Write a protein that binds this ligand. Structure first.
Ligand code: SF4
Length: 208
């Protein structure tokens, strides 16, 4: 009766799950978005990565992390010697929540409410039980709070391997900055922040 749960089929197959998510009406976000954007990768992945939501490029590509934030993430993964093809990557919510400004060059993402995050979380649980990752990288506040609690502060736990007792399979969790946050700002601050993202990715990759 709650959120996305009745839309989630009783299967761990990622292709089946993604097809079903295309029909989800578990919150209001399906209405204005072009399509649901499920995760990408396969069930043998040892590392799962979760962002906030599909953005403007992802909403139309049908794949996660294809825009500028995704290209920065690719650069950080390469510096961390992680092959993106070996990951399962997804987002805490699966429809793009957005507005447009007059004169704007893109659709502008808006923050999912906690209500929307909780509504969509059945998909994330299905992905986690399907993939059985050894470690989950939480990119940004929305994703981290989805699993660690609404009060959790990414800025206060950088570099730490976390484990919480009601996440399925008890994977390690590593919460880090979202790559979109490193696209703008002073040069020295962007460079320090990028190095910190590489460090956190390496923490995740060194898990068992
Ligand atoms: S954001 Fe998630 S819960 Fe909401 S309609 Fe889309 S897939 Fe369903």
């Amino acid at each position: 009766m709650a959120g996305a749960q009745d839309f989630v089929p009783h299967t761990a197959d990622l292709a089946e799950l993604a097809a079903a998510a295309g029909e989800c009406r578990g919150c209001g976000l399906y209405r204005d978005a072009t399509q649901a954007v499920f995760g990408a990768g396969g069930r043998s992945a040892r590392i799962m990565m979760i962002g906030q939501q599909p953005g403007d490029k992802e909403d139309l590509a049908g794949l996660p992390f294809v825009g500028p934030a995704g290209r920065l993430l690719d650069r950080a993964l390469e510096a961390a010697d992680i092959d993106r093809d070996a990951l399962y990557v997804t987002n805490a919510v699966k429809h793009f929540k957005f507005t447009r400004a007059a004169g704007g060059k893109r659709r502008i993402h808006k923050t999912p409410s906690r209500t929307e995050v909780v509504a969509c979380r059945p998909w994330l649980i299905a992905e986690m039980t399907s993939v059985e990752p050894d470690v989950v990288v939480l990119l940004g506040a929305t994703a981290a709070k989805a699993l660690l609690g609404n009060d959790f502060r990414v800025t206060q736990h950088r570099g730490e391997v976390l484990h919480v007792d009601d996440v399925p399979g008890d994977p390690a969790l590593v919460a880090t900055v979202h790559p979109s946050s490193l696209l703008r700002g002073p040069k020295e601050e962007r460079e320090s922040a990028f190095a910190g993202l590489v460090d956190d990715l390496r923490v995740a990759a060194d898990v068992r």
